[PDB]
């Protein structure tokens, strides 16, 4: 269903455009240290806040990369931007990386709320899973992915406290070892 | 099929974000004249070149609007940009407007070429039509659309010369009368 098109659109109109130029952008910043790879958050609840420091204050915005621009579909200098965050753990800087949510999941969340979209609110989790799975299969085979990015899919427990998002990211970041 | 999700995603992650701020952006430019409304090109052949002056040299890039920025899905200051074109007719400036292609149609075109996307190349025209139709139905009811934008859907003849894209746009622009 809908997650398949959105996963493909996310690759085609974003990942395949930005991944081949990412390492080069990261070097340039590091002169003027940031881990290689784009870390893409995939919350299966589709809860995508716009400010990441509100998902977890241990994720703390540092800076932006150098913008990448390109002429796209009649738009001159369409801008692709990405943000660099520091991951904190017990008050210590434990990691630095380019981190963001996968925006199509916010697009599934919204769809589920608009009547005329014929997308039922209880189909969210199944579409989110389909989106993650489609996207992994795309990136296994993707020439533009060689390292390059890491998917961080997760599901919060029902419905207690704990869950650290920073710790979730820190786990994958440490793996890169 | 896939065009439904893409139309909804186009509204949700773009049109509903940019249309409420567009008129205000157009006034600001006009101080430092451009028709109101975003003109969105919908070629049913899904042929979306990146440079519009290559679709028709009578469409000639003038300037960009003031960028609109917002914090979106962990990205700080994601940038929405739009380009202003002059429409020429027999060497005379006949119109000035903010013009672009609908990018999801380029996303359908690409999908049709990747084997693993299970999207057959001969289903393009039917998905393009579905995308246009879904998008019109979204924008009939859309509070964010009140004027605001104009869809210009068209299909080139098989397979002679003529067809002017500038003339196609000029027709809808003149209607706004
Ligand atoms: N500048 C940007 N920043 C973050 N994601 C973007 C992006 N441009 C495109 N995307 C991603 O690609 C998807 C499809 O974009 P289009 O343009 O085909 O929704 C989007 C979005 O999640
Ligand atoms: N900065 C931008 N310029 C032009 N179109 C954009 C845009 N950001 C998003 N869109 C449109 O919205 C669709 C979905 O974007 P996302 O982000 O959810 O593909 C995209 C694209 O056609």
Swiss-Prot record, chains A, B:
Residues engaged in binding 2',3'-cGAMP: 9, 14, 78, 103
Subunit structure: Homotetramer; in presence of cyclic nucleotide (c-di-GMP or cGAMP), forms tetramers and higher-order oligomers through side-by-side packing. Interacts (when phosphorylated) with IRF3; following activation and phosphorylation on the pLxIS motif by TBK1, recruits IRF3. Interacts with RIGI, MAVS and SSR2. Interacts with RNF5 and TRIM56. Interacts with TBK1; when homodimer, leading to subsequent production of IFN-beta. (Microbial infection) Interacts with human papillomavirus (HPV) protein E7.
Cross-link (Glycyl lysine isopeptide (Lys-Gly) (interchain with G-Cter in ubiquitin)): 76
Documented effect of changing residue 113 to A: Abolished translocation from the endoplasmic reticulum in response to cGAMP-binding. Reduced phosphorylation by TBK1
Signal sequence extent: none
Outcome recorded upon mutating residue 104 to A: Strong decrease in c-di-GMP-binding
Protein's name in the database: Stimulator of interferon genes protein
Result for mutant: residue 82 to A: Strong decrease in c-di-GMP and cGAMP-binding
PTM annotation (Phosphothreonine): residues: 69
Intervals, Cytoplasmic compartment: 1-177
Tissues expressed in: Ubiquitously expressed. Expressed in skin endothelial cells, alveolar type 2 pneumocytes, bronchial epithelium and alveolar macrophages.
Modification(s) after translation: Phosphorylation by TBK1 leads to activation and production of IFN-beta. The phosphorylated pLxIS motif constitutes an IRF3-binding motif, leading to recruitment of the transcription factor IRF3 to induce type-I interferons and other cytokines. The phosphorylated pLxIS motif facilitates SENP2 recruitment during late phase of viral infection. Phosphorylated on tyrosine residues upon MHC-II aggregation. Ubiquitinated.
Modified residues (Phosphoserine): 81
Record note on what altering residue 76 to R does: Loss of deubiquitination by USP44
Effect the entry attributes to changing residue 5 to A: Constitutively active mutant that promotes the production of type I interferon in absence of cGAMP ligand
Consequence the record notes for mutating residue 80 to S: Strong decrease in c-di-GMP-binding
């Amino acid at each position: 269903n809908v997650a398949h098109g959105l996963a493909w659109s996310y690759y085609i109109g974003y990942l395949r455009l930005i991944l081949p130029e990412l390492q080069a952008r990261i070097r340039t910043y590091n002169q003027h240290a940031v881990s290689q790879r784009l870390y893409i958050l995939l919350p299966l609840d589709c809860g995508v806040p716009d400010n990441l420091s509100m998902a977890d204050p241990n994720i703390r915005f540092l800076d932006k990369l150098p913008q990448q621009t390109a002429d796209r579909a009649g738009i001159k200098d369409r801008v692709y931007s990405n943000s660099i965050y520091e991951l904190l753990e017990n008050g210590q800087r434990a990691g630095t990386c380019v981190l963001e949510y996968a925006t199509p999941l916010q697009t599934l969340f919204a769809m589920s709320q608009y009547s005329q979209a014929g997308f039922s609110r209880e189909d969210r989790l199944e579409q989110a899973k389909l989106f993650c799975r489609t996207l992994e299969d795309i990136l296994a085979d993707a020439p533009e992915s060689q390292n390059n990015c890491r998917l961080i899919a997760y599901q919060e427990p029902a419905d207690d406290s704990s869950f650290s998002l920073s710790q979730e990211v820190l786990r994958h970041l440490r793996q890169e070892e």
